[PDB]
Design an enzyme around this catalytic site. Structure first.
Site, PDB file in Angstrom:
ATOM      1  N   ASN A  11     -48.660-102.603  33.850  1.00  0.00           N
ATOM      2  CA  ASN A  11     -48.866-101.911  32.553  1.00  0.00           C
ATOM      3  C   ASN A  11     -50.374-101.761  32.320  1.00  0.00           C
ATOM      4  O   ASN A  11     -51.022-102.756  31.965  1.00  0.00           O
ATOM      5  CB  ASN A  11     -48.172-102.666  31.421  1.00  0.00           C
ATOM      6  CG  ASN A  11     -48.355-102.017  30.069  1.00  0.00           C
ATOM      7  OD1 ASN A  11     -48.818-100.878  29.976  1.00  0.00           O
ATOM      8  ND2 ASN A  11     -47.990-102.738  29.020  1.00  0.00           N
ATOM      9  N   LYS A  13     -51.732-100.229  29.951  1.00  0.00           N
ATOM     10  CA  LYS A  13     -51.908-100.149  28.480  1.00  0.00           C
ATOM     11  C   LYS A  13     -52.847 -98.974  28.173  1.00  0.00           C
ATOM     12  O   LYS A  13     -52.815 -97.967  28.906  1.00  0.00           O
ATOM     13  CB  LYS A  13     -52.379-101.499  27.932  1.00  0.00           C
ATOM     14  CG  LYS A  13     -51.499-102.683  28.319  1.00  0.00           C
ATOM     15  CD  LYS A  13     -51.803-103.951  27.555  1.00  0.00           C
ATOM     16  CE  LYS A  13     -50.918-105.105  27.969  1.00  0.00           C
ATOM     17  NZ  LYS A  13     -51.260-106.337  27.228  1.00  0.00           N
ATOM     18  N   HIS A  97     -42.271-102.839  24.256  1.00  0.00           N
ATOM     19  CA  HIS A  97     -43.447-103.700  24.542  1.00  0.00           C
ATOM     20  C   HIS A  97     -43.869-104.404  23.251  1.00  0.00           C
ATOM     21  O   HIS A  97     -43.834-103.753  22.190  1.00  0.00           O
ATOM     22  CB  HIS A  97     -44.603-102.914  25.171  1.00  0.00           C
ATOM     23  CG  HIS A  97     -45.633-103.821  25.753  1.00  0.00           C
ATOM     24  ND1 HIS A  97     -46.631-104.398  24.982  1.00  0.00           N
ATOM     25  CD2 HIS A  97     -45.782-104.306  27.005  1.00  0.00           C
ATOM     26  CE1 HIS A  97     -47.365-105.174  25.758  1.00  0.00           C
ATOM     27  NE2 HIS A  97     -46.871-105.131  26.996  1.00  0.00           N
ATOM     28  N   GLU A  99     -46.573-105.086  21.888  1.00  0.00           N
ATOM     29  CA  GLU A  99     -47.648-104.389  21.133  1.00  0.00           C
ATOM     30  C   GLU A  99     -47.037-103.304  20.239  1.00  0.00           C
ATOM     31  O   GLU A  99     -47.525-103.128  19.113  1.00  0.00           O
ATOM     32  CB  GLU A  99     -48.702-103.847  22.094  1.00  0.00           C
ATOM     33  CG  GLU A  99     -49.542-104.962  22.693  1.00  0.00           C
ATOM     34  CD  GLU A  99     -50.149-104.669  24.053  1.00  0.00           C
ATOM     35  OE1 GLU A  99     -50.141-103.483  24.474  1.00  0.00           O
ATOM     36  OE2 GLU A  99     -50.615-105.639  24.698  1.00  0.00           O
ATOM     37  N   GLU A 167     -41.760-111.364  27.427  1.00  0.00           N
ATOM     38  CA  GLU A 167     -43.179-111.525  27.020  1.00  0.00           C
ATOM     39  C   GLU A 167     -43.314-112.742  26.112  1.00  0.00           C
ATOM     40  O   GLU A 167     -42.828-112.719  24.982  1.00  0.00           O
ATOM     41  CB  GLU A 167     -43.664-110.303  26.249  1.00  0.00           C
ATOM     42  CG  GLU A 167     -43.626-109.012  27.035  1.00  0.00           C
ATOM     43  CD  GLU A 167     -44.169-107.883  26.181  1.00  0.00           C
ATOM     44  OE1 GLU A 167     -45.396-107.833  26.025  1.00  0.00           O
ATOM     45  OE2 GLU A 167     -43.364-107.137  25.583  1.00  0.00           O
ATOM     46  N   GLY A 173     -53.048-114.464  23.369  1.00  0.00           N
ATOM     47  CA  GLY A 173     -54.137-114.372  22.375  1.00  0.00           C
ATOM     48  C   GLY A 173     -54.009-115.388  21.251  1.00  0.00           C
ATOM     49  O   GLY A 173     -54.546-115.113  20.164  1.00  0.00           O
ATOM     50  N   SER A 213     -49.179-114.286  31.096  1.00  0.00           N
ATOM     51  CA  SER A 213     -50.438-114.286  31.874  1.00  0.00           C
ATOM     52  C   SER A 213     -50.117-114.612  33.336  1.00  0.00           C
ATOM     53  O   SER A 213     -49.718-115.743  33.616  1.00  0.00           O
ATOM     54  CB  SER A 213     -51.430-115.258  31.293  1.00  0.00           C
ATOM     55  OG  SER A 213     -52.627-115.231  32.052  1.00  0.00           O
TER      56      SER A 213
END
Lengths: 252, 250
Positions: A11, A13, A97, A99, A167, A173, A213
């Protein structure tokens, strides 16, 4: 019956220029990785680079869009329909996704409708699920992942062209680190959910890939887990390291 | 004098075959001079390379949207930098469909306009009131508030076109009159004169984004404060050329 084929999605992004795309594609085109029988490789550039990537990328790697519209085209300024992707011979799409769920407020039902519509046009789908730190700390990991998966399952009659990406948003983060064992735990519980709520056959044959990750260093340890069928790679998909993640398929 | 401006918003429509036909039809068109009319065509993201590579160089290409800020971890979004990199000069921002269906706030639209301008894009910035807002008597309150969110963030007015969309007159059974278009455009230009500058009011194109066809283009285009059109569905058809030709009314 047959072993699940290891799957590695990249991905990109919201990243890339024509110059960077040429460099990335050249690096992938020169890569020496396991056979198409051992690993299925998908790369997902932004919409505007889909034509450039599809025209220049090695034919044994497949192209994905990062999103598509929930239904037939028409008066939806800025949106790209599933039939446009089919028209441009883009075989894959990433849907739901983290996001898009978090930043653009895509509901589980909206994602489910997108998956069903994409499959109906003949697209293959990487369907993304995952829980936030708040949800994990509340003890809601499998409640959230099961609910996201159920919204898709309620709208899907044929799982053949679906890959599920887990995910761990709680470990993206936040300062929290997901262990391989924590990845395997969610993959195991999700596959058991599919077995009980869809069918034993769907549970046994559906790839569940890890969207946390992943780097060259941890790919074989993450990959060498009973219920981990590969990766949806974020930022590393722009770098030569992506090739090392594809090579993790030899662990199976 | 403000140069007449005609944008064609293809929306979520097109195949490689249909795009080739549309582009061929535009390429063969004989329209007013570049001094009389500025023409922008806005295909979906995936057809921007095909349209930019094949379209007559005196017509300009627009994206239908872009991201609010620098690229990065925004799966599915297209940054202003990407459009500039692909030599796409224009972007449509704050279209009524994105405000209504995808819940884009006036502030979010304003931030997109500022960021697009900062990367060197030219912007068609869209404003417009719903039937509920018009019936409440809130037309200029809503349009002024949407315009203010943009105006507060604009860094280069030279590269801005404002599109007024009478959303109240799109799929409601209500018909927007030339007098109603003129009223909103005049009040919006007076708002710009008081709240930005007389010079910005005098030089900024305000285009009509309601239902435009060959038949009504001259009557809409002839209004003192209407500087052109953002065309929807007709932009896919040869009729778009007749709408460009309405520019001779100025």
């Amino acid at each position: 019956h047959m072993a699940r084929k290891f799957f590695v999605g990249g991905n990109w992004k919201c990243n890339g220029t024509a110059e960077e795309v040429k460099k990335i594609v050249n690096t992938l085109n020169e890569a020496q990785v396991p056979s198409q029988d051992v690993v299925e490789v998908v790369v997902s550039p932004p919409y505007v680079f889909l034509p450039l990537v599809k025209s220049t990328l090695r034919s044994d790697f497949f192209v994905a869009a990062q999103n598509c519209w929930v239904k037939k085209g028409g008066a939806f300024t800025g949106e790209v329909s599933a039939e446009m992707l089919v028209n441009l011979d883009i075989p894959w799409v990433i849907l739901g996704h983290s996001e898009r769920r978090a930043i653009l407020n895509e509901s589980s039902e909206f994602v489910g409708d997108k998956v069903a519509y994409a499959l109906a046009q003949g697209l293959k789908v990487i369907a993304c699920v995952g829980e936030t730190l708040e949800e994990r700390e509340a003890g809601s990991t499998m409640d959230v992942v099961a609910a996201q998966t159920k919204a898709i399952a309620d709208r899907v009659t044929n799982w053949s062209n679906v890959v599920i990406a887990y995910e761990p948003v709680w470990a993206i983060g936040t300062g929290k680190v997901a262990s391989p064992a924590q990845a395997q735990e969610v993959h195991d519980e999700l596959r058991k959910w599919l077995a009980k709520n869809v069918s034993a056959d769907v549970a046994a044959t559906t790839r569940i890939i890890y969207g946390g990750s992943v780097n060259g260093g941890n790919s074989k340890e993450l990959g060498g887990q009973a219920d981990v069928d590969g990766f949806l790679v974020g930022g590393a998909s722009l770098k030569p390291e992506f090739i090392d993640i594809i090579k993790a398929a030899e662990v199976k």
